Symmetry: D2
Subunit: 457 residues, 4 copies
């Protein structure tokens, strides 16, 4: 059985915004679904009237907080599933990811001695690009639940535009629960840090992290001692992010803000912040041009073929007003390359006078296939890229601004290594990702401890 | 085609002992239930048993605390929103407008009551209604709300479709998502909300009547600021979600067990913060009351003009067996010509039980008539009068007039007669948009709040 | 014996460059100075150069900030207390009563002005006064305040005693100690202070006249609390100390250099937060104005009916050479029959300089007469009228009526005629306790605040 | 020359309070000044009308905060000059002592993981007892500035009742400045802890304290990172205390509170809290009986001849209502005796069901005369008594509640040892105390670091 929505049957956009949005979407767009234009149209028309996932005042606030990051006064933690699935979009799963993020953020806040902006990969991370249209089984590749189905059969892999509305319903339900959890005792600092004390007790390398975990606990107790109750603390904010990949979905979720900011602007209200991937960041393509029309903070992924000149051109197109925190440059080069490739990019971009956020994505540049047949990543390479990234920035005198990690609160066996010493054979036990291998809950927390030590050095 | 798209549907169950209790309670007869097949209902319940909840238990505990304060005479309850939410009107401007209307009332009422106002919206789930007549005036089976069937006057639309349970959830969670965002925003800023109230005074035909009180409120707000209170100092702005718990297939699917981190796990309906049981489904030995008994949420019961003092006491004993102030709200809808006579003996007998309920006034439901022009309508003056009569009752007994429960919208509709705009029978035809009962429009609802604030100040 | 006990008296000096500046300024002639021997004055100054300060520079910087807000039209200045403090009345009940009176006024004024009130007491140093007549009506040399000589009508007491400089300091620091404690206490709690205002309304003969405004204030306070503001949320309650800077031996001894932890060291008079220069000592080329020029404290100048617009501008140029809003307060005491005529040309000319002074009304000083029963007195109605005229002046020019400067006490004295109590010439004899000018008693001062709050609300 | 005050020429006390106050003062009183009764009377009559040094609402609040201490939920730091002098009652000196106390309190708060109640020996510590009426020079002994003069000549040593009013004027001026300093940037946590960072840089043992000082700094930064500004912190409270020694002064400074607490009570408004010394704690003497009539929190000094039974009797007389924090038992036994003498006292008092504060006074039991002729104390004995005191409590399972130390913000050379290795010969350079040797500013801060480590163990 299925549920059924009606196709609906405001004053138009300001003329200039229609023009610019049309011109952006007329450009070539890579990695798009291949479904009929008429059926896409119907689904976009449904989504043009739904309640938004986010609102403009939140995005404006995020932009403020990210400006602090870019100025060297805060740090950005971005993390969650590689690919959300409708099947796994449950309260236990969402809570776990929200918890894992909060757990990391408190460790990171302590180590950085500055605020941590928390951005989950959630409430929309339902689309992925692929280098191959045919996968290793000879099936049309799975592109995420917004496009087709994970099941390895041909009928499941057909692109289905009704997945756009299912995506939005899943996203909005998830966001609802994220808001509720963050305004609960879940986000209480003292609760979150007791979880961190259980980790130390039960990890095989818990002795290695005991001292920092105790220093944190002592820091929290000091706050309380000085007369700071929970009510004194601004409540926890977890923002929603995903890759802006499916332009039918992003364009349908655009909303025109008020002239309470001065000029009406387009905001993508599918999320607070979105990024553009390595396979869709064609400089004259639709995704970059779309990013130029929306008011949200944005990010661009930068891999090992990046040049300093092209990085500058992203800066100049996407932060044309010199607004710190509008743009995030995310670097994945792998651990064996970050120390050699990143510095020339950083130096050229810093010379422009613009202030981007420099964020490390350790995971994407460090993936291999195990002998047992699983797409995996070694924990030690993930840690080493972040280490290299910090070394780049320290030598320069620039700000290592944040990390972008794939994680879950589940005890998955997806990435090799960590204190639990996950082996190739262990991978088979709980390899649950619909896409890339995630740090499990313990490995994500171990990473935060390790990165906190980088911040303290 | 016919302008539809289908969306396909694809965790540990609740504990055995809890299920055994629930199964015993739900064996009771349930009035007004949809007539869809059991097997299809089961499949939809199973979907909904694993979805993210609309609300979470800590919010409901908090609401229970705030309602205890109401029941003790230290806070006032404002409950309002659409009579019937529809899927097609479940949009950003509409939701924003109803949230704004509620907040606009609440500030006027907070000022008049000199005490906090607990704000509960009829929203994010008010998608089912009872029908007295199985055949409507067009010869169709009756519209029962969007969770059951379609408003459109055609037989295919009116068939009871169990897939609407999921559509309802998706709508409710989306709406709640936006309510949370809005409340977290500048929308709930006191100063912003009260500027809207200043525009109302300047433009209303009876603005001169409300000017003095509106000025007194503005001077109050400006005094706060003068004393060195910024918005950041103010309590976070909370709008709770409520609806009539009617469709037991939905409500039972949305039950969850709280975690063990406070006292002990309790059973909550996480489709809303609070629910009520309506006049047509409040059979003492029926399934609706038995459901209300087993959940931990705060609950309400509508009490109309056939109520007896003895039956009201039996609600109190079934639904507040542990004597928890604020757990039970008794919602009086006598009508304006009967409230002064019927309510006191009910109040006296319940008060003698030792229990502390919240006494809430529903002015609207007892005061509905059909206009000569053919529209279901209510007179503004009879609404205002039932609230006046309710206050007189409580005044006289020394009990607390605890709140109001109204049907309102932020839209400039023409559904209720009267008010400062002097909506006539003829005006009704212009913007009669409700899928069910006539609502106070945005101006009427604000005027009601000013008039009730004067009742609170007497 | 004769009922006295003697108390025996037993650090790096200020920087040379600063001293050279000060020595040049103080070479100027100083009117109204005590006539005690130089050598004994020097010894007493030397004691006072090492004592703990009455105030500290961070408080004065903060006051300067708050006064800038007044000068910009965003806050209102309330300055009040005894005409002349005496050592013998420098007691806990008296100080408490004056602090209470000031706080009672300030809440009424804050509500009426819809903006913060900066509270400055005439206290902890108002121990010196000018005398026109070197011989008083009893044939004695005039009482000049307790810092100089004794009130008692006998020749030994009236001799100028330089030891009174130390007595004054000891009294001022003790009083300030208690003002700080009181302000840190429940005394400055809004809710406590405004309950006192409710008792005034119930017991005053004109209480019916003020009832409505008093109720509106109470509803304002209760709204704050309803919105979830507790006392702990409120700004800390600040009462600043002021007096007329008259005795330059005291003022110069109490100068200190701020430390280097903000901008650069500045020279402050730490005998008070703010001082003013009176009508008899404001010679443009005299030592009082030159002293005011060199200190960093906010300062005031009294402007009486001989003032010219040109002389007022010369005060502005000498005393606010850096164009710092709030640094200079111009305190008008025209009298009620002259303020509407004399003040506007002064205001227009000063406003044309580009500088932002605070315009403050001293109703009391221009409105003093001798009763037929032989008491120096003032009529309540002429006091209220000068403030009314001051507001009319500023209204008309679009300038800000910035504050009032009144003489008041928390005691139930009989010094000023009129008010709701209808104090008569005959009543004056009952409790005429001032060592100098007649003060508003506690009821009169509160009534004035209600009347001025109505001026602010028009 | 001298300044001159007038002898003044409320409804009487409730009858029962007059009775009890008369009965208390009729008891024998040790260590009183010998000045004529008539002249004393005149001075008491002046002091009965002066503005009080403290007010009852402050004392009630202190009693709340001390109840937290007694329950094991806060710690008490009490410190300042051994004897204040009129000559040294200056802004530079007061500020220094207030700073030194604040500096210690932040270190202690961090180490204790709980609030620190800060009580200065100030604004009245002008009277001292003496074992001998004739000192080593053959002069009538100096008893503090409230009684006679420090100068070593016979005329200066005569007891002068006018010193009562001079004392009060000095006390009130000092209290005024203490209030002003604590509501200033002086008491800002971040300012206070930068001073602690200079100490670490310039101390000879700074390397030993670097790690804790950095952990504190990181704790402070974490607070700021989590969104706690100064405005969020309740402002710093420093309470005033002294030995209640001169009964002419204490009785004259009594004030009757309101019936806003229910029953009118007598409060000694010369201070917030006072203590009774080893030489005046006669169980049936006037000082203990006076302590029983006033509502202030009080303390009793307990030296090495104390017994468990007599400790209990102080408890039962002075905390007859079982009000936690009303009574503080202060132990000085010396470092070589505390571990053996204190436990039996603690065990018997804990068995009563009453909750006193257990406070260590390291200095008084550990004084000796140097070969160079200076009354002095070794830093290492001071530290060791506190160590012993903590060991007593830990074995018991009771709460080491606080310390009572003699300190100054001046760089004095009065106590031997510390990281600066003050020698007998160094003593001569800046031996400025009018009475017992104080920890100087560095030694007081080193002590706080050391006691913080005891708290953390
Ligand atoms: N209200 C529309 C769109 C919608 C679908 C699902 C969730 C939220 C909105 C419908 O039900 O058809
Ligand atoms: N995740 C489930 C259930 C669901 C429906 C709609 C909104 C949220 C969740 C699905 O996509 O069918
Ligand atoms: N006011 C009294 C007592 C007093 C003395 C010193 C300081 C404070 C009060 C006097 O001057 O004689
Ligand atoms: N300490 C000095 C000055 C002083 C006088 C009075 C009060 C305060 C300080 C003295 O006793 O003479
Ligand atoms: Mn991935
Ligand atoms: Mn209805
Ligand atoms: Mn005067
Ligand atoms: Mn000592």
């Amino acid at each position: 059985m299925n549920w059924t929505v009606d196709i609906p049957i405001l004053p138009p956009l300001p003329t200039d915004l229609r023009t610019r949005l049309d011109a952006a979407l007329a450009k070539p767009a890579a990695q798009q679904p291949t479904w009929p234009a008429d059926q896409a149209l119907a689904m976009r028309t449904v989504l043009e009237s739904v309640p938004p996932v986010t609102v403009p005042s939140e995005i404006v606030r995020l932009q403020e907080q990210l400006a602090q990051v870019a100025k060297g006064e805060a740090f950005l933690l971005q993390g969650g599933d590689c690919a959300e699935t409708f099947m796994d979009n449950t309260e236990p799963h969402i809570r776990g990811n929200v918890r894992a993020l909060l757990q990391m953020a408190v460790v990171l806040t302590y180590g950085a001695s500055m605020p941590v902006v928390k951005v989950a990969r959630i409430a929309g991370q339902y689309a992925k690009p692929r280098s191959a249209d045919i996968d290793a089984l000879g099936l049309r590749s799975y592109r995420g639940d917004m496009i087709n189905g994970f099941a390895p059969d041909a009928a499941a892999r057909e692109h289905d535009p009704s997945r756009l509305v299912r995506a939005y319903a899943n996203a909005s339900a998830a966001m609802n629960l994220v808001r509720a959890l963050t305004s609960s005792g879940l986000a209480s600092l003292h609760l979150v840090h007791d979880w961190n004390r259980e980790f130390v007790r039960t990890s095989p390398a818990g002795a290695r992290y005991e001292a920092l975990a105790t220093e944190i606990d002592r820091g929290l107790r000091f706050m309380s001692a000085c007369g700071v109750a929970d009510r004194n603390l601004q409540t926890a904010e977890i923002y929603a992010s995903h890759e802006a990949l499916v332009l039918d979905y992003e364009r349908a979720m655009l909303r025109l803000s008020d002239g309470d900011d001065g000029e009406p602007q387009l905001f993508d209200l599918s999320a607070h912040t979105v990024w553009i991937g390595e396979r869709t960041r064609q400089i004259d393509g639709a995704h970059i041009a779309f990013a130029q029309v929306i008011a949200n903070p944005v990010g661009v992924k930068l891999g090992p073929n990046m040049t300093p000149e092209l990085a500058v051109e992203y800066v100049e197109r996407l932060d044309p007003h010199n607004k710190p925190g509008r743009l995030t440059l995310v670097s994945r080069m792998g651990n064996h390359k970050v120390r050699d490739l990143l510095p020339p990019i950083v130096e050229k971009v810093q010379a422009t006078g613009h202030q981007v956020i420099w964020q490390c994505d350790p995971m994407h540049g460090n993936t291999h296939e195990s002998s047992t047949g699983f797409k995996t990543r070694h924990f030690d390479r993930i840690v080493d890229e972040v280490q290299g990234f910090f070394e780049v920035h320290r030598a320069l005198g620039t700000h290592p601004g944040g990390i972008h990690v794939e994680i879950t609160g589940e005890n998955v066996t997806e990435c090799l290594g960590g204190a639990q010493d996950i082996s190739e054979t262990d991978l088979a036990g709980r390899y649950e990702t619909a896409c890339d291998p995630r740090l499990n809950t313990q490995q994500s927390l171990e990473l935060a401890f390790l990165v906190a030590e980088m911040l303290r050095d």
